[PDB]
Amino acid sequence: DSLWQSEDLESVVDEDVQRTCILHGPVASQYTSKVDEPIGDILNSIHEGHIARLIKEEYAGDES
Numbered sequence: 705d706s707l708w709q710s711e712d713l714e715s716v717v718d719e720d721v722q723r724t725c726i727l728h729g730p731v732a733s734q735y736t737s738k739v740d741e742p743i744g745d746i747l748n749s750i751h752e753g754h755i756a757r758l759i760k761e762e763y764a765g766d767e768s
Contacts, residue, residue, distance in 0.1 A: 709716050709724040716723050728736075759765055 706725045707727065710726040713719050713721060713724065759767055
C-alpha cells in the first residue's frame, strides 16, 4: 500500500513529496507539462487535433 500517499500528502511525514511513490510512464512524461488542467480540455485538445488534421488530409480542409 504505497500508492495512496501520492495523493494523500498531508498524512505523509513533513508533507514531503520525495517520500511518496508516484507511478508515471517514462515516455508519457514528455507530454505532461501543465498542472491542474481539465481532463475534458486535455481529451478535447487531443481529439480536436486529430479532427483538424483529418479534415486537412482526408477531406482537403472541406468540412462540408
